[PDB]
Amino acid sequence: SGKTSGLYTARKLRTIRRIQRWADKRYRKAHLGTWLKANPLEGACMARGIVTQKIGISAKQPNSAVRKAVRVQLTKNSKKITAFVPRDGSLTYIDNNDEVLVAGFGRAGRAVGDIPGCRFKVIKVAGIGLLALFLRKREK
Amino acid sequence: VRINVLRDALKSICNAQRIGKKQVIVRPSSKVIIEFLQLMQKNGYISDFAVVDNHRSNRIVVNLIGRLNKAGVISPRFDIPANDIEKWVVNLLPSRLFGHIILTTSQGIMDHIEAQHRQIGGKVIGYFY
Amino acid sequence: PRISRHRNSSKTYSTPKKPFTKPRLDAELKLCGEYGLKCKREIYRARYMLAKIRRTARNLLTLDENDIKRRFEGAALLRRLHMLGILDEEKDQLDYVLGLRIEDIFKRRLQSVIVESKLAKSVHHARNMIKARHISVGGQIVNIPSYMVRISNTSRVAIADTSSLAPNGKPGRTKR
Amino acid sequence: PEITVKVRKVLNNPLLQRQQCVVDVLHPGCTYESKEAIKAKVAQQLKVADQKNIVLYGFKTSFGGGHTVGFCNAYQNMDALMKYEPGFRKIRCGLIEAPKPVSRKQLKNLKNRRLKKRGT
Amino acid sequence: RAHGGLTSAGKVRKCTPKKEKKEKPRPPRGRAYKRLLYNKNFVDDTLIHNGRRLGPNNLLIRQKLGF
RNA sequence: GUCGCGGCGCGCCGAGGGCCCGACGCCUGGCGGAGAAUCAGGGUUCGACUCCGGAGAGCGGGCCUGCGAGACGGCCCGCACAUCCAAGGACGGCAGCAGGCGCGGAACUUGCCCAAUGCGCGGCGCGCGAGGCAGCGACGGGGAGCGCGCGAGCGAGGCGGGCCCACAGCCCCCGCCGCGCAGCCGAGGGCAAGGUCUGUGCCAGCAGCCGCGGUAAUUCCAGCUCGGCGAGCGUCGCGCGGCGCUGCUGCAGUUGAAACGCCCGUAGUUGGCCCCCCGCCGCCACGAGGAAACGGGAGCGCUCCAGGCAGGCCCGUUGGCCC
Lengths: 140, 129, 176, 120, 67
Prior knowledge:
The structure is cut from a larger assembly and holds chains A, B, C, D and E.
Chain A lengths: L11 H10 L3 H7 L2 H5 L10 E9 L9 E8 L4 E6 L15 E5 L15 E6 L2 E2 H6 L5
Parallel strand pairs in A: 3-5
Antiparallel strand pairs in A: 1-2, 2-3, 4-5, 5-6
Chain C lengths: L21 H14 L5 H22 L6 H16 L17 H7 L1 H7 L6 H9 L3 E3 L2 E2 L15 E3 L12 H4 L1
Antiparallel strand pairs in C: 1-2, 1-3
Helix pairs in contact in C: 2-3, 5-6
Chain D lengths: L19 E3 L13 H11 L7 E7 L8 E6 L3 H6 L3 H7 L11 H11 L5
Antiparallel strand pairs in D: 1-3, 2-3
The structure holds one RNA strand.
Pfam families (chain B): Ribosomal_S8
Keywords (chain B): Ribonucleoprotein, Ribosomal protein
InterPro entries (chain B): Ribosomal_uS8, Ribosomal_uS8_sf
């Protein structure tokens, strides 16, 4: 690195920092401003909505089983995004259009683990938590 | 080109001492490099020195006690208040036992120890380990 | 301006930087049994109080003696620590805080004094006796276990008249 | 088993025809005796006479033993006793009586209902 | 091909044998649970330390403890 | 012309202005600051909510009253959208408090209310959905319990008292009595804790991550057990640290990501020794005068803090001091 160092050089360093700040994938993710418009979720923990067609996405490798997910149109942005169902055999409860909240996969954008092409994860159906429906803690 | 005479002198003195050659030459004598050298001699790191004098830049021949561990410069001078003298001791001095940072104050040019004790802080010319 | 909402909140409970470390984990249970702490939030509550008491001293040590900010604060540091008794009054040193013991804050806790003075003779017995309002400091009955008493007034710890000291005449269910 | 009264200090007031004081009681584990037994004890200790003129208001028992914090107002002048002390404790003291009013929103309702005209 | 999928509905999850908790009262929680832990995992001679520390969920502690 | 200087306007002239140190333009899910978050330093991030200034009351204009407003629970018009409306008319404005509709992930009583705390009219008191008070409320905090022990002990409560309080409540204080009572995450590694025992066939599913299930699962599905934390545990989106992975301190560029193909060149940045004394620069020491809250931080035992600035025979007792 050459580096420009002088008592009167707060210009080179100020422009350089501003321009070279947006080089990181993470920095650009939060500083371009594209991510709030681009994400299906408008930068929120959960989004309400109505359920649409259910989906059976093939897994990759090692995982080798279809993981049932439901594609739901979020009411606020009128856009359809798929949400991975919670625990074992929890999709049978979800059928026709019903109130569904969807949440992040931790990664915040990347698809979780080795199940390919799924960015979001369903957390609720109707008015009862879908992880309680699985345990029959709270179910219709 | 040559902007910092002290860096070319510091690495002149440090490099020579690394080979163990007590007598060393410096391409230009500066009244400020006189300050660092005589504060080095005063602290006892360097031994008797001299400047063979032409009418031009002048060349400095310095004999050494051979004990110098490290010397160096902060380019260009950055001014610190007498309140912040100790943060600069942490970054550029190994220990607070053999700490010496060359400061410049209007009332005489001294090493860091004496200056903060005198409650005056100026610019750090060069590091002295 | 919603005047009654105006207030302040505190964070005595501070969790550590790496949770599942075997040495920290084992010491927790070991300390929990030693001073009879019902919850593990308290040991961290102690850690937060200990740190503040550690930093003040480190900054004070780096100041030269008799520097006014150093002198007044140093005497202050000693005054509060000597009241606690974790710092022996004899030590009287601003630098003496360094090398401090968490066990000493635990020792200061009044629940500890009851076990040591054989008032209840056990930490488990001590918490139960304080729960049943059976130990009073200077006669001021306290049912909260961690009264925490300054050593300067440790000699004034006392028992309670309801059913432990000279029975008032209320033996729990036994009375009826 | 006593209502011993500390009466810790008094403050003289000539301007307001009262002599506000800090009172306190000593209850050695005894139930603090209401306000009436304290009231009799306070007046005798006050040495101003007339149990009604002295007023003990808002007593707080300290947890356990009784050392109630609070105030004693020696309103020897009766008119001041009937006016300066807070009205709410004055009615409970028996200086005056309290009837039944409205929400005061109804008072506002009256002001609003007749506000529109020029004399109705 | 018919490997499986959405038609499969937690076949193993519903096929687990129906089970119930072994009858048991409540060891009191709090410092009493902490004291039970202080004994179960600390001191108490060989109960947690047969030779070297056996381990809390260890098979060797089990059976000697009872189950 | 205005309270007033002014291009502010209105005439009259002369050609000026401002710019790569980025002018002008464009955009902003742009109120700024005191502050807030997380961190050794160095930072980074957010500032709408206490307070402080600025604005604005559906939207644009104009105007009155006044000493001051372009006031909006002043007016009058344009524009939307209303409401009554007997067909002839009128009359709104909740980004004040509740409360609905709408909306979303989500966000408190169509309560009581001037006694206080300040402000209005007013020495012989009244109002103020300001506020005060209660309600609601796992936003969040700060502090207990489910026993201890071999006996007897309490605290969540029931009833009455006291206390309290515009009024009630609450902690508290008293008695008969006392009805002790837990979760939600994991257990192959990071990361702490069973190769126990059951279903199991790369099926379901698990799975932050790295990885497991292909017929004998430490990885799922359950009951065992057990680790952690705890009346709070987890799941998400977020900011900071991690991350010297944004680098000024403090990063790389011969092959990981990276020296313009080459040279001149204007701004820009950088210029060796060198004139002791003067004068300006910059520059430190260092004051004056710089609102708090908040935070650093005297003293102080609410049943202990979190709290607060109180308290008692008292520094003119406080509330010092650094912001």
